[PDB]
Amino acid sequence: EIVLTQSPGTLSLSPGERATLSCRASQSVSNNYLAWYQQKPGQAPRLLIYGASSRATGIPDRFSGSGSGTDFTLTISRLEPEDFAVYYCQQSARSFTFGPGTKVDIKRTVAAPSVFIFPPSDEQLKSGTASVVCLLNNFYPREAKVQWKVDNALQSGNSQESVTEQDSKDSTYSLSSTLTLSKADYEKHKVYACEVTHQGLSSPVTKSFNRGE
Amino acid sequence: EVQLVESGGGLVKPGGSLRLSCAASGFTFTNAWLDWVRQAPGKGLEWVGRIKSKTDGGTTDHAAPVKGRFTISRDDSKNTVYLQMNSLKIEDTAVYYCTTGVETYDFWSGYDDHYYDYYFKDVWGKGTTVTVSSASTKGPSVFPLAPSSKSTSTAALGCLVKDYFPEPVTVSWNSGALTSGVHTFPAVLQSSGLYSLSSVVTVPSSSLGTQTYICNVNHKPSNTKVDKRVEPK
C-alpha cells in the first residue's frame, strides 16, 4: 500500500510570499488519483485540488497543483492570511491514504523563550502527589525543547508537554512541560531543574529551585 | 444544499461497541461514494473505509487497522451510511467524519452529452467524537502555579488543572476579564488515563502585592466548578 510523505513538516512564510509544498508517493501513481486538502483548527478538511492539478469548485486561483509519477507540488502563488493552515496530500490509487501534513505558519523574527519553573504547590503535596511545571513562553520558531533534571540526573518517561497555536498578534508559541513525581520521590531529592534549548538563546537556559528553600 | 451529518459517537470502554451514522441530505447515494475519515487528537487524517454508490453495487472497503472490527453498511431507505465499530481500542479515539464528492454537469446547449462543463467539490460532516477509555468520571484538582517578584524572565503564574476525565474543562481568568498574557494549553492525557491541563498568565512582577489573579475552572461532567486565587509564595 502506498505511503505519502510530505516535506517540510512546517513551512514558515510571510503573507504575500509564494508557498511550494511537496508530496512524494512510495509508488508511482497516475495523476487522476492525487489530491490536496487544507485543514484549519476546529474544522473538517477542505479539498483544494483533485486529479493532481484541477481546482475544486470555489477554490481560489492562487492554489494550483502540479507534478506526476512520485513527485507532486501544491503551489500557493501569494499567501493570504487565511492560508496559514495544514495541507495534506491524498491518494486513491491503492487504497486511500493521506500524507502526514505540512503546516504553513507565519514567519517572524527569532524570539527566544522566557522560562519559568514552578515547584509543586503546598496544596498538591497535601493531596498526595507532586508535579513540577516549566513554562517556555513566547518563542519563535516552534522548535523549543525542554529536559528535566532531578539532583542532576536527566529524567525520562515522566514528563508531558503541550504547545499553543501560533499567537494571532505576535506570531509566537508557548510550551508547558510537567514533571510527574510521587510525593515520596519529590521529598527524596533536592534540586529540580528544567533545561531549555532554542535557536534564539545565546546559550541554553536552566531554571531551577531547591526543595524547601 | 448537499450536507452530511454524523452521529453516534460517545465514550466507550476498550472492547466496547458503537454504531456511527452518516445521514445525507440534498442527495442520495445512488451515484455517490461515502468515505469515513478519522483524526486522533493532535494527529493527521486517516481513512477508515469507503462504501461505493448504489449504481456500483454498494461495495465496501476498510482500512487494515480496523478490518474485521469496523463494518460499513447502508440503509437505502434512510439515505444513511453506518459504521459499526466493535472491539474498540484506545487508539481508535478520534473525531470521525464522513465525506463524499459531489459532481455536477453543465451540458452545452446544441451539442450532445459528451460536451459539458464539469464541477467537482467535496462535502464533509462536522464530525462525531469517539473516546475509548477505561477511566471513570473524575473532577480535577486545581493547583496554583505561584509567581514571585524574584522569578522574572515579567512574572508568571498559572493553574494546573490535574487528573480529570473525560474532556473538556474550560479555564478563564478573573471571570473572563483577563486575557492579556494568558496561555491555556492543550490538555494532555496522562499514563493514568486522566487528563491534565495547564493555564498560565504573564504579569508585572511589581504589582503582585495588589493585583488579583483567579483561574475559573469548570468540569461539567463532574459538576466541578472551582475558582482558585493564585497568590505569591
Numbering used by the authors:
A (entry chain L): 1 to 27, 27A, 28 to 94, 96 to 213
B (entry chain H): 1 to 52, 52A, 52B, 52C, 53 to 82, 82A, 82B, 82C, ...
Quote the study on this structure.
Here, we describe the structural characterization of an apex-targeting antibody lineage and autologous clade A viral Env from a donor in the Protocol C cohort. We previously characterized the V2-apex PCT64 bnAb lineage from an elite neutralizer in the International AIDS Vaccine Initiative (IAVI) Protocol C (PC) cohort (Landais et al., 2016, Landais et al., 2017). In this study, we combined negative stain and cryoelectron microscopy (cryo-EM) single-particle approaches with X-ray crystallographic studies of early and late autologous Env-antibody complexes to decipher molecular details of the co-evolution of HIV Env and the immune system response over the course of several years of chronic infection. Comparison of Ab-Env complexes at early and late time points reveals that, within the antibody lineage, the CDRH3 loop rigidifies, the bnAb angle of approach steepens, and surface charges are mutated to accommodate glycan changes.
The early Fab was the closest relative to the least mutated common ancestor (LMCA) among the PCT64 monoclonal antibodies and neutralized early M4 virus at an IC50 of 0.0229 μg/mL. We solved crystal structures of both the early and late Fabs at 1.6 Å and 2.4 Å, respectively. The overall structure of the late Fab was similar to the early Fab, apart from CDRH3, which at the early time point adopts a β-hairpin at the base but is “splayed” at the tip, resulting in a very different paratope. Whereas crystal packing interactions may influence the CDRH3 conformation (MacLeod et al., 2016), we concluded that the splayed conformation of the PCT64-13C was the likely conformation of the unliganded antibody based on two observations: the early Fab contains a Gly100D “hinge” that could allow for splaying, and this conformation is observed in the cryo-EM complex of early SOSIP-early Fab. Consistent with computational predictions that sulfotyrosines are common in earlier antibodies from this lineage, we observe a sulfated tyrosine at position 100I of the early Fab CDRH3 (Landais et al., 2017). Due to the disordered residues at the tip of the CDRH3 of the early Fab, we were unable to confirm whether any of the other tyrosines in the region are sulfated. Electrospray ionization (ESI)-mass spectrometry (MS) analysis, however, indicates a heavy chain molecular weight ∼160 Da above the predicted mass, suggesting the presence of an additional sulfate in the Fab. To further investigate the potential N130 glycan binding pocket in the early Fab, electrostatic charge potentials were mapped onto the surfaces of the Fabs, revealing a shift from positive to negative charge near the apparent binding pocket for the glycan. In the early Fab, the positive charge is mainly contributed by Arg93 of CDRL3 (patch a). When the PC64 Fab structures were positioned in the cryo-EM maps, the splayed CDRH3 topology of the early antibody would create a larger interacting surface compared to the later time point antibody.
